Every structure is written in structure tokens, then in C-alpha cells.
């Protein structure tokens, strides 16, 4: 919904790197200069607001997206390790930024 001139926007508070253990939950957010509607990305992939598509299924992981004027956010609950060093960024017509999601393994090589 674009009531007023929502051509482009400016970045005021870019994203930030976040590292969590396997199964944990990641959180990302950013600020803008004006209202706008962009798109989120994960591991170089274009996510959907309503429902995803392609090789990935709509029933693989749980995520939350909060879009409010110049306030975006994306939390990934139960982040898998296999997706270590993921790429979480919000692409929009006027701004371009992204972050790095590092995921370490809970257990390591000890016995065996």
C-alpha cells in the first residue's frame, strides 16, 4: 500500500552481523528515511512476504517479518547450521545493504 510518493528511501540504520548457535534464533532489523516496501534475502535467495517458492518449501523453517513505514525486521527462529554464514539483507528501491549470519555447531569433535 503506497499512499504517498514511495518511489525510494534512504538508509539511516543499516543491518548488523549476528552469530548464534544451532537451533537458536537470529534477529535482524534496519531503519529508513521514509516509508517503503522492499524485499528480504537469505543466503542469496529472494524470500516472499506471503509464501515462498522454488526449491525451498513453505514448511521448512519459521520466520517473522515486521514491515512498518521506515522500520524493517526479520527474525529466523531455529536457524540451522548447514546454512552457516548466511546472507541476510533487505533490498529496496533506494537502498542496498546486507548482513552476515554466522552459525556455529553446538557440539564438536571430542570423542570417537
Swiss-Prot record:
Widely expressed, with predominant levels found in the heart. It is found in: Cytoplasm; Cytoplasm, Cytoskeleton, Microtubule organizing center, Centrosome; Cytoplasm, Perinuclear region; Golgi apparatus. Core component of the 3M complex, a complex required to regulate microtubule dynamics and genome integrity. It is unclear how the 3M complex regulates microtubules, it could act by controlling the level of a microtubule stabilizer. Acts as a regulator of the Cul7-RING(FBXW8) ubiquitin-protein ligase, playing a critical role in the ubiquitin ligase pathway that regulates Golgi morphogenesis and dendrite patterning in brain. Required to localize CUL7 to the Golgi apparatus in neurons. Component of the 3M complex, composed of core components CUL7, CCDC8 and OBSL1. Interacts with CCDC8. Interacts with CUL7; the interaction is direct. Interacts with FBXW8. Interacts (via N-terminal Ig-like domain) with TTN/titin (via C-terminal Ig-like domain); the interaction is direct. It is linked to 3M syndrome 2: An autosomal recessive disorder characterized by severe pre- and postnatal growth retardation, facial dysmorphism, large head circumference, and normal intelligence and endocrine function. Skeletal changes include long slender tubular bones and tall vertebral bodies. This is Obscurin-like protein 1. It comes from Homo sapiens (Human). The lineage of its organism: Eukaryota, Metazoa, Chordata, Craniata, Vertebrata. The gene is OBSL1.
